[PDB]
Write a structure and sequence with these properties.
homodimer; alpha/beta; Collagenase (Catalytic Domain); five-stranded mixed β-sheet; binds the ligand CNC(=O)[C@@H](NC(=O)c1ccc(-c2ccc(NC(=O)c3cc4ccccc4o3)cc2)o1)C1CCCCC1; binds calcium ion; binds zinc ion; Collagenase 3 (chain A)
Chain lengths: 160, 165
Amino acid sequence: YNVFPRTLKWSKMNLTYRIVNYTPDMTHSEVEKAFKKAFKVWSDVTPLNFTRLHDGIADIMISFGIKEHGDFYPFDGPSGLLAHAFPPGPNYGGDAHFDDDETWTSSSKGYNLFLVAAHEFGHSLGLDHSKDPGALMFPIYTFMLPDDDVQGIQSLYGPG
Amino acid sequence: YNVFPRTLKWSKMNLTYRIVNYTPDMTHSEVEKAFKKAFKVWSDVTPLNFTRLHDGIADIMISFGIKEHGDFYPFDGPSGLLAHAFPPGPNYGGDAHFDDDETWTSSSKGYNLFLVAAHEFGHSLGLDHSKDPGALMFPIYTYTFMLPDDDVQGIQSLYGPGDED
Ligand SMILES: CNC(=O)[C@@H](NC(=O)c1ccc(-c2ccc(NC(=O)c3cc4ccccc4o3)cc2)o1)C1CCCCC1
Ligand SMILES: [Ca+2]
Ligand SMILES: [Ca+2]
Ligand SMILES: [Ca+2]
Ligand SMILES: [Ca+2]
Ligand SMILES: [Ca+2]
Ligand SMILES: [Ca+2]
Ligand SMILES: [Zn+2]
Ligand SMILES: [Zn+2]
Ligand SMILES: [Zn+2]
Ligand SMILES: [Zn+2]
């Protein structure tokens, strides 16, 4: 028999990401900085490293989109699903999509992009949802990575 | 804190299924009996329970369709691909699609909906294809039922035996 193995985690410690498109809600600069920040969250506590490609195929393809945007996990206008990301793996694995019918903001007026991104980037790293309300990976939107997550990611990749 | 499951599988033992529409070939009753039986193949050897919803959103949506029907895998007219289903996961995860350009039957002539369904639902639960030419999860259709042991050992690695009697 065969089942569908899951890529529990990335093989390599060096990962590439590409920001394909941009929300109208923040400067390009602010966006790039929000993601660099969201990757630092997990690079700080693991051997993991993130470098950004400007073209071509990357391990973590980041995009913004609305409704149906090419994977049949369609978004839903404003409110509700803020974003989503695929677990570690080839092809689609690791990719992060952000519902561009939400208002992304580099602060509090809307959903802070960096916060949501850092959350999503755990899903890209193999992290599942947490039930600890203090955990970044808690499903509900609300910087120091909480021990709950530090333990979760380290359990996979180890410390730095 | 939580980490992703080693393999694709359902997080809960209680799963829901909905027959979204029906094929013209067989009656509503034949279609529901074939699917109920198809599900029982798998619940009989695991702790899984399958409940049917008449409307709404189930873990496993079942529908019949032709050519392009709402995903990346269009059907192709008669013969060729008979059907397919997606592995466990959100949205269309676990959903099974049957090509309505085929002839579906509860007998031998045509394609036996029960047998194809049994195989497809295997997919819905996280089984891929076997290499054993006598495994239910063998990719190629053959008419004949006792669930082969490669399939049993396959599903139990995923969800355990349930009650072993
Ligand atoms: C005509 N077109 C096809 O067949 C294409 N098939 C499909 O799309 C497809 C979907 C599901 C099946 C299928 C295959 C085997 C069985 N189980 C059994 O037939 C079975 C019955 C049985 C009874 C006792 C023990 C073991 C058993 O196994 C049940 C269903 O086939 C396929 C062809 C091959 C390449 C890809 C495209
Ligand atoms: Ca939304
Ligand atoms: Ca990718
Ligand atoms: Ca907007
Ligand atoms: Ca066909
Ligand atoms: Ca589904
Ligand atoms: Ca038909
Ligand atoms: Zn998407
Ligand atoms: Zn999440
Ligand atoms: Zn389909
Ligand atoms: Zn198959």
